[PDB]
Structure 1
Amino acid sequence: PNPTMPVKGAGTTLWVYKGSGDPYANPLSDVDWSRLAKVKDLTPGELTAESYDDSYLDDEDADWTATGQGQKSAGDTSFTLAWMPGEQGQQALLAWFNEGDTRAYKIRFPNGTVDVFRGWVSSIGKAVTAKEVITRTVKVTNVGRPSMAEDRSTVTAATGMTVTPASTSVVKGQSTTLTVAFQPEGVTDKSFRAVSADKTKATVSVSGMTITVNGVAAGKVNIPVVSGNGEFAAVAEITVTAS
């Protein structure tokens, strides 16, 4: 469950809220959530927006049209799933359609991250064919703003900038390793770059979360290492001998 790398999207599940608390509060817990099993496929909502004209006569440079973002919509979420009329959850789905109330429903992704929306049923279909299991197709029109998985995400910048260099001699044809700790009390979410100070006696390669330093020419060389936008940095000095 790494929410910083791409995922294959298999194992995603779907639930509908059946409690009375705050669905947006704790969507990680599936206590008061009824699962819709046998989900054939799912098309999530499309968060769109409408534009307002932002062109005034008093403006200079009237050659290019200008706009601005207005209200935003939460789109419709569709999904088809195996038709099981005797299974509770489908009965709850038809009750949701008939009563027509606005209810919350969450989608659990195979990252540990969830996406909970809130809407009402606007379509209940069904495809009947031989040699293929009967499917029930549902469409939910969403209202208001939903809680994306990027809302529950957290960042950490606890200032743990540590640089451990080799700080030893290197020779022609060999290389040395430079290490940068990315543990501001462990958790981190940033990036960094490193480069030599001359590019005439030594070369650097920043990969594998390490720095490979190659002494093409002898002498004293320096390597700045700056993390992120420039929040923190360090300097390493490496000696290259004639031998």
Structure 2
Amino acid sequence: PVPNPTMPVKGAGTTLWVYKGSGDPYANPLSDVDWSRLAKVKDLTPGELTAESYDDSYLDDEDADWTATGQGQKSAGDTSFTLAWMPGEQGQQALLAWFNEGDTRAYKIRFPNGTVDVFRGWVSSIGKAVTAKEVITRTVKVTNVGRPSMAEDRST
């Protein structure tokens, strides 16, 4: 009802997709052609962008009472999510093949306000939890490579 990217949104209805194309995943992320959904998402934690610190001090500085630093190398973090375990689904088979082969692939997060986030990465963890009274869950962690394509890139 309110797909407004200038106002807060509650985030119910967020979807995860994985690329299966030979083109550029960053060129047109709003299109759902050649993307496959990962359904039944129970929990999602997107990667955090961070940067290291670089020392800017010299012996000749007239002011040395306070530290001075600069921005260093940047990182894209790890994305971690939980699905319902369904080995018969094609998406989870493709996820397991992605872990086994060791490729760096592109994936999307789509938010209810109408914006997408695109990352590239490789899988670094695959887990499971078994409890008598709860549905069995599949846990995934992806390490991101390079510069992502945030929503604010397409704000215009």
Q: What TM-score do you get using the length of structure 2 for normalisation? A: 0.96
In the comparison of the two structures, how many residue pairs are matched?
Answer: 154
Q: CA deviation at 1:139?
A: 0.1
SS at match of 1:58: coil
Q: CA deviation at 1:103?
A: 0.2
- Unaligned 5+ segments in structure 1 are 153-241
Pairing 1:117-132 to 2, within 5 Å after superposition: 117-132=119-134
Give distance in 2, aligned partners of 1:111 and 1:54: 41
Pairing 1:9-48 to 2, within 5 Å after superposition: 9-48=11-50
Q: CA deviation at 1:70?
A: 0.9
Q: CA deviation at 1:71?
A: 0.7
Give distance in 1, aligned partners of 2:98 and 2:6: 35
SS at match of 1:89: helix
Q: CA deviation at 1:41?
A: 0.6
Give distance in 2, aligned partners of 1:47 and 1:125: 24
- Per mean C-alpha deviation after superposition, the further-off stretch among 55-64 and 76-85 is 55-64
Root-mean-square deviation (CA, aligned residues, Å) is 5.8
SS at match of 1:150: helix
Query: Which residue is 1:72 aligned to?
Result: 74
Give per-residue Cα distances to partners, 1:17-45, cap 9 Å, x unaligned. 00110000000001110000000010000
Give per-residue Cα distances to partners, 1:132-163, cap 9 Å, x unaligned. 000000000000000000000xxxxxxxxxxx
Q: CA deviation at 1:15?
A: 0.1
Give distance in 2, aligned partners of 1:136 and 1:34: 18
Give distance in 1, aligned partners of 2:89 and 2:122: 21
SS at match of 2:153: coil
Q: CA deviation at 1:6?
A: 0.7
Q: Taking CA–CA contacts closer than 8 Å with sequence separation of 6 or more, which of the two structures ends up with the larger relative contact order?
A: 2
Identity %: 99
Give distance in 2, aligned partners of 1:61 and 1:51: 19
Q: CA deviation at 1:60?
A: 1.6
Q: Which has the higher helix share?
A: 2
Give distance in 1, aligned partners of 2:104 and 2:8: 32
Query: Which residue is 2:137 aligned to?
Result: 135
Give distance in 2, aligned partners of 1:58 and 1:2: 52
SS at match of 2:90: coil
Q: CA deviation at 1:124?
A: 0.3
Q: CA deviation at 1:4?
A: 0.4
Q: CA deviation at 1:118?
A: 0.3
Pick the aligned partner of 1:115 from 105, 114, 117.
Answer: 117
- Unaligned 5+ segments in structure 2 are none
Give per-residue Cα distances to partners, 1:149-201, cap 9 Å, x unaligned. 0000xxxxxxxxxxxxxxxxxxxxxxxxxxxxxxxxxxxxxxxxxxxxxxxxx
Give distance in 2, aligned partners of 1:72 and 1:42: 22
Q: CA deviation at 1:57?
A: 1.4
- Structure 1 residue runs of 4 or more that deviate by more than 2 Å after TM superposition: none
Give per-residue Cα distances to partners, 1:49-87, cap 9 Å, x unaligned. 111101111112110001110110000000001000000
Give distance in 2, aligned partners of 1:58 and 1:149: 43
